[PDB]
Subunit: 258 residues, 2 copies
C-alpha cells in the first residue's frame, strides 16, 4: 500500500533559468493522471529553489520539490549553510541528507546525518536518508551488515513517530555515476533488510509504511524491474533527472503505466 | 585611494521574505549620496539570492550582493554545492571564501580556499578571501606570521592580474561574534602585513589596489577607528548586518 516516489537529484547542475525550463518540460511531458499513482519531486540546487517554487505554485503543478542538503543548526553563525526553516518557507517537501557525495567529500558521518534528519523533521520536511556501501564492502560480501549499521547510526534514538516521517534511499556507491546499476535482486536484498531493521528501530506497523528507494544509475530502461520489487518503493534519480523526456518516462513507468 | 567596502555577511539568517524586508530598509536608510564614497554589499544565504537579485535590480537599489560560499567545481555530481556560474547568473558581485566557520566546521584548508578563489575568478566574481588566527596563536604573538602563511596558501600560484581581482578579509577567530573586537592598531598591524606580502605575491602596484577588510565584532561604535587606519579598507560585518539601521550607520561612518 506504499505509494511510489521518484526523487530527481539534479546535483550541481542548472542555473535558475534552466531550472524553470526543466520543470516546465517535465510537467508537460508527464500527464496529470499519473500523480494519482506516483509522487514525483525535483531536487534542485539551493539557488534554484525559489525559481522552482514560484513556477510550481504559480502554475499549480503537481510536482513537489526539495533540497540537496540542510544544516543541522537553527539560524546562526554558520556561513554558507541553509536552515530547515528557510527550506520550509520556500515550500520544500523533501530534503536529501547524507548523500554519498557529502558523506565522502564533506565528511558527513552517521551522527551528522542524524542531526540533519532531526532538523528536517523539526521544520516539517521529509528527509531522504541516504545509505550505501562501497565496492570493496560489496566485493567482500558484507554489504547487508554495512548498510544496517549506517541505518542504525543515521536514525539513532529517533522515536517510532519520527522514523515514520523519513524516507530511506539505498544508493550503493559503486552505482553512482558509473552506469553500473544494481540488479533488481541486489536492490531487493538490501531494501528488504532495511525494512526488517526498521522493525526494531520503530515498530512493525511504521516499518511497513516507510518508503525505501533505490538509487544509482536509475533510468527508464532499468527502473521497472527495480521499483517492481516488493521492498523497493521508488528511485532516487541522478543524471536522468536533468533530462525532461527521460525523467518523465521513467516516472510514468514507476507508476505502473496507463 | 582605495574605495572603502562594507560587506554584510548575514550567515545562516533570514528567509526570502525577511531578506526582502532587510534589503529594503538598508537602502532607505543609506542615502544614495553615500554610494560615491563607499561600496556596500549584502551577502545573503543561497536561498535568498534570487529574491535579493530581483529586488535590487527591480527597484534599482545601489547595494550589490554576493554569496557565502562557492564550489571549486564547475558542475556535476557534487550534491548540495553551488557553482560559480549559478552565482554569476544571479548577478552576484562577491563571494566569501574560506570564512573561519567553513575552515573549522567544514574542513576547508588553504588549498580548497585557493580552488574556490579560482572558481570565483573564472566566473567574474570577486572573492573575499578570509584569513585569521585563533586565540592561542594571538596570545603567543605569532599572529602576523600565521596570517601571512594563510594568505600565501590561499593565493598560492595566482598571477598578479588575478590577485588584483580578489579582496582579503582579516577576521581573527577570537573576534568573531565574541564582542572582542581587534583594536585599531591591531587591525592595522595585520592588514599592513597582508598588503606587504601582496607586493611579493603580485607586485607593488597590485598590492596598492587590493582592498583589505577587517572583520570580527564590527559595529557602528568601533568601525570608524578601524577603517580609518591606512591599510584597512573596510569591514566584513557579522551580526550587525542583520540590523538595517546599524548596518547603514556603520556604512555611512566608513564613507567618512
Ligand atoms: Na515496489
Ligand atoms: Na582605511
Amino acid at each position: 500500500a506504499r505509494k511510489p516516489l521518484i526523487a530527481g537529484n539534479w546535483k550541481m547542475n542548472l542555473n535558475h533559468l534552466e531550472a524553470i525550463s526543466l520543470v516546465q518540460k517535465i510537467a508537460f511531458s508527464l500527464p496529470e493522471k499519473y500523480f494519482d499513482k506516483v509522487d514525483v519531486t525535483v531536487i534542485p540546487p539551493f539557488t534554484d529553489i525559489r525559481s522552482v517554487q514560484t513556477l510550481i505554485e504559480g502554475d499549480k503543478l503537481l510536482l513537489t520539490y526539495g533540497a540537496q542538503d540542510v544544516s543541522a543548526e537553527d539560524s546562526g553563525a554558520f556561513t554558507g549553510e541553509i536552515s530547515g526553516s528557510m527550506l520550509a518557507k520556500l515550500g520544500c517537501t523533501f530534503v536529501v541528507v547524507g548523500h554519498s557525495e557529502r558523506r565522502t567529500l564533506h565528511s558527513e558521518d552517521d551522527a551528522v546525518v542524524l542531526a540533519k534528519t532531526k532538523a528536517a523533521l523539526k521544520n516539517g520536511l521529509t528527509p531522504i536518508v541516504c545509505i550505501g556501501e562501497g565496492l570493496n564492502i560489496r566485493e567482500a560480501g558484507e554489504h547487508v551488515a554495512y548498510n544496517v549499521a549506517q541505518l542504525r547510526g543515521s536514525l539513532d534514538g529517533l522515536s517510532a513517530d519520527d522514523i515514520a516521517k523519513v524516507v530511506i534511499a539505498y544508493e550503493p556507491v559503486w552505482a553512482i555515476g558509473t552506469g553500473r546499476v544494481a540488479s533488481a535482486s541486489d536492490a531487493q536484498e538490501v531494501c528488504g533488510a532495511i525494512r526488517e531493521e526498521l522493525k526494531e528501530l520503530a515498530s512493525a506497523e511504521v516499518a511497513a509504511g516507510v518508503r525505501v528507494l533505490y538509487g544509482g544509475s536509475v533510468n527508464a530502461k532499468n527502473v521497472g524491474e527495480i521499483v517492481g520489487q516488493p521492498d523497493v518503493d521508488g528511485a532516487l534519480v541522478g543524471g536522468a533527472s536533468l533530462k525532461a523526456d527521460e525523467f518523465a518516462t521513467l516516472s510514468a513507468i514507476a507508476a505502473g503505466g496507463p
